[PDB]
From Swiss-Prot:
This is LIM domain transcription factor LMO4. It comes from Mus musculus. It comes from the Eukaryota. Disruption phenotype: Overall patterning of ventral spinal cord neurons is normal at 12.5 dpc and 14.5 dpc, but there are additional ectopic V2 interneurons (V2-INs) at all axial levels of the spinal cord; phenotype exacerbated in an MNX1 mutant background. In an MNX1 mutant background, genes typically expressed in V2-INs expressed ectopically in motor neurons (MNs). Abnormal guidance of motor axons in an MNX1 mutant background. Expressed in a wide variety of tissues. Transmembrane segments: none annotated. Residues 62-121 form the LIM zinc-binding domain. Interacts strongly with LDBS. Interacts with LDB2 and LDB1. Interaction with complexes consisting of at least LDB1 and LHX3 acts to disassemble the complex; may preferentially disassemble LDB1-LHX3 complexes rather than complexes consisting of LDB1, LHX3 and ISL1. Interacts (via the LIM zinc-binding domain 1) with RBBP8. Interacts with both RPPB8 and LDB1 through the same face and cannot bind to both proteins simultaneously. Interacts with BRCA1 (via the BRCT domains); the interaction represses BRCA1 transcriptional activity. Interacts with DEAF1; LMO4 blocks export from nucleus. The lineage of its organism: Eukaryota, Metazoa, Chordata, Craniata, Vertebrata. Transcription cofactor. Plays a role in establishing motor neuron identity, in concert with MNX1, acting, at least in part, to disrupt LDB1-LHX3 complexes thereby negatively modulating interneuron genes in motor neurons.
Length: 121
C-alpha cells in the first residue's frame, strides 16, 4: 500500500487566528493620549477667555513633522510621539491616527496592518 500521506498540519485545523498575534515582536502599541485641556467646554473661552500663561512651550516633540505636537490627540508608535497626520502608513500615507489601525514595522518603516504582510513579512 502507499496510502501514507494526508493533511495533518494545515487545512484539517483551519481555525481563525488573531490579525497578527504571532507578529507581536513587529507589533506596536497605539497609545491614544487624551488631552484634558479643551474637552470641557465650560472650562473657559479657549485661549482667549482666560489668561492661562503656560510655561511649556515645547509640549511634546513630534517625530513625524519634526516640530512639536500642537494637535488635539497625540498617538504612540514604537517609542516616539505622533499625531493624526504624522502617524500614518509610509505606503498608504493614510492617517493611522485617524483610523486607529494597529500598524506594524520591521525595517523602521511604519506600515499598516495589511501593508506589512504585503511588503515585508
Ligand atoms: Zn507631526
Ligand atoms: Zn499601508
Amino acid at each position: 500500500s502507499l496510502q501514507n500521506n494526508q493533511d495533518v498540519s494545515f487545512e484539517n485545523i483551519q481555525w481563525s487566528i488573531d490579525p497578527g498575534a504571532d507578529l507581536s515582536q513587529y507589533k506596536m502599541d497605539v497609545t491614544v493620549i487624551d488631552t484634558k485641556d479643551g474637552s470641557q467646554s465650560k472650562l473657559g473661552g479657549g485661549g482667549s477667555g482666560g489668561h492661562m500663561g503656560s510655561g511649556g512651550l515645547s509640549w511634546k516633540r513630534c517625530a513625524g513633522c519634526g516640530g512639536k505636537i500642537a494637535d488635539r490627540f497625540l498617538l504612540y508608535a514604537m517609542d516616539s510621539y505622533w499625531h493624526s497626520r504624522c502617524l500614518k502608513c509610509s505606503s498608504c500615507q493614510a492617517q493611522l491616527g485617524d483610523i486607529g489601525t494597529s500598524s506594524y514595522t520591521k525595517s523602521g518603516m511604519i506600515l499598516c496592518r495589511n501593508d506589512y504582510i504585503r511588503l515585508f513579512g
